[PDB]
Design an enzyme around this catalytic site. Structure first.
Site, PDB file in Angstrom:
ATOM      1  N   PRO A 193       0.865  -1.156   0.000  1.00  0.00           N
ATOM      2  CA  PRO A 193       0.000   0.000   0.000  1.00  0.00           C
ATOM      3  C   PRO A 193       0.921   1.230   0.000  1.00  0.00           C
ATOM      4  O   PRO A 193       2.003   1.123   0.596  1.00  0.00           O
ATOM      5  CB  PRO A 193      -0.708  -0.206   1.362  1.00  0.00           C
ATOM      6  N   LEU A 194       0.567   2.282  -0.699  1.00  0.00           N
ATOM      7  CA  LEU A 194       1.409   3.491  -0.757  1.00  0.00           C
ATOM      8  C   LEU A 194       0.729   4.617  -0.055  1.00  0.00           C
ATOM      9  O   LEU A 194      -0.526   4.725  -0.210  1.00  0.00           O
ATOM     10  CB  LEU A 194       1.741   3.880  -2.223  1.00  0.00           C
TER      11      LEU A 194
END
Lengths: 63, 65, 65, 63, 65, 63
Positions: free
Chosen positions: F1-2
């Protein structure tokens, strides 16, 4: 509404302050958004780090 | 310059077209940049994916009173 | 590194897959970064939501002559 | 086509200029986009402000 | 502050709502910022448009052994 | 996830390091993501370049 403007470094303090007022007015006028609900971030990018046609704006200015 | 706008879903097409024009005029007048050098990208976010105060716009709309 | 690309809608799946690979090779060769450390995210924008000169790509396409 | 690359601070001027040329070539080759239509911004991030696994790149380099 | 999250498609609605709340609590406790001043925008990317190592998450999923 | 967090300049080193740990924990807890798979960038914005209601945070603090 959230607005991010990326532009080249070297703008005056007047220009950045003016841009933030004017973009806010534009959103308020066109969307009906209360001005307090408009949030703007101005990001300034050095000319060596912005490319068009594979050449930096710094090079394009020199050449 | 590049102007990226994040809006909630549900604006009319006419309002989005008017916003693009008006943000562009604002950058033209304040920076001097020619209109053809201003790009605007408008992104629409559904209200279940926008949070304020840790609750989504959808949840905040379902309890506003 | 993170590479975020913004494109107009309508590219083929094969072109998007080839772009991801080629942007990754470009970052690998120029920076030395291992390919597995390069991430690319491709975002597609409809032409009614991309403006140049204050007019949308859709509007500019409808009057190009 | 618009391309934003975020990477760690400390790159040489050669590396940034090379990256902007090479990413532009890649977009031109794969999409058929004229090179002048490819625009690239390179954003550099200090290693104290990039986290993986909850630790900064600066800490991960030290530890 | 503004928190923009990029996730692969396919998380449940309940997980996305819990993430928004938990990222907001994390910014509140560590920065002191009131919860109502924290905004979170969650963007979902399809796996054909997310690349690692020059290959899409979809392609990497189709060959994981 | 960013995760990208944009916040105002002037945070302490403790605060930024703490934020990167805590946002990572939140993603791990709520999504089941291994902590090593969570990547966070913290971008700090000068108060003259963040607007609310068409006025910069720098002006709003003064006025």
């Amino acid at each position: 509404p959230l607005i991010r403007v990326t532009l080249l470094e070297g703008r005056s303090p007047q220009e950045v302050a003016a841009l933030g007022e004017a973009l806010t007015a534009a959103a308020h006028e066109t969307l009906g958004t209360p001005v307090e609900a408009v949030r703007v971030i101005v990001e300034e990018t050095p000319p060596e780090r912005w490319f068009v046609g594979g050449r930096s704006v710094a090079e394009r200015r020199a050449s």
